[PDB]
Amino acid sequence: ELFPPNLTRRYFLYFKPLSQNCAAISSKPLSVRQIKGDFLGQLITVRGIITRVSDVKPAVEVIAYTCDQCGYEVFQEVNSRTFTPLSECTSEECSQNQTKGQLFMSTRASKFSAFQECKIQELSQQVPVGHIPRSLNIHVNGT
């Protein structure tokens, strides 16, 4: 494909859990102790108090580059927390013209999304005797 489809998705998408009055686990709140390792991958609901909130900063999704000699553009998609930027124009036409041109990054055609990180903690009146309260890290993107 010419470019990754993520580059032109102008929208965000989210799921809203089942109404408990129609009801399933996503409708039934869990305290931060009940979130065992069994739940990894699932959609759940959590009840608690927020302890701290970060301020908004951008995160990359698709990065855009320009090749100087052959005047051609290439894209890279980022999922992990870190990445290596590109540094060689591997395009077949550029290669067959033996044109070992240099790649440079561009903001004006890259795609970002808003990011924020928070932390949630269990209610003090639900802590069992002699224990210290536990907490979870929450991530938030889009609108």
Catalog residues that contact Zn ion under the rule CB under 5 A.
67, 70, 72, 89, 94, 101
Q: How far is the CB of 68 from another protein (least distance, A)?
A: 12
Q: How far is the CB of 73 from another protein (least distance, A)?
A: 17
Q: How far is the CB of 96 from another protein (least distance, A)?
A: 7
User: Applying CB under 8 A, which residues contact another protein?
Assistant: 69-70, 96-99
Distance between terminal CA atoms of the chain? 29
Helices (H), 3-89: none
- When the beta carbons of 39 and 68 are compared against Zn ion, the nearer one is 68
- When the beta carbons of 72 and 115 are compared against another protein, the nearer one is 72
Q: How far is the CB of 109 from another protein (least distance, A)?
A: 24
Could you list the beta-strand ranges (E) of 1-143: 49-53, 57-67, 72-77, 103-121, 135-141
Q: Would you state the structure tokens that stand for residue 97, as one six-digit string?
A: 């013209």
Choosing among another protein, Zn ion, none, which partner's interface includes residue 115 (Cβ < 5 to 8 Å by kind)? none
The full DSSP string for 100-136 is: -PPEEEEEEEEEEEEEEEEEEE--GGGPPTT----EE
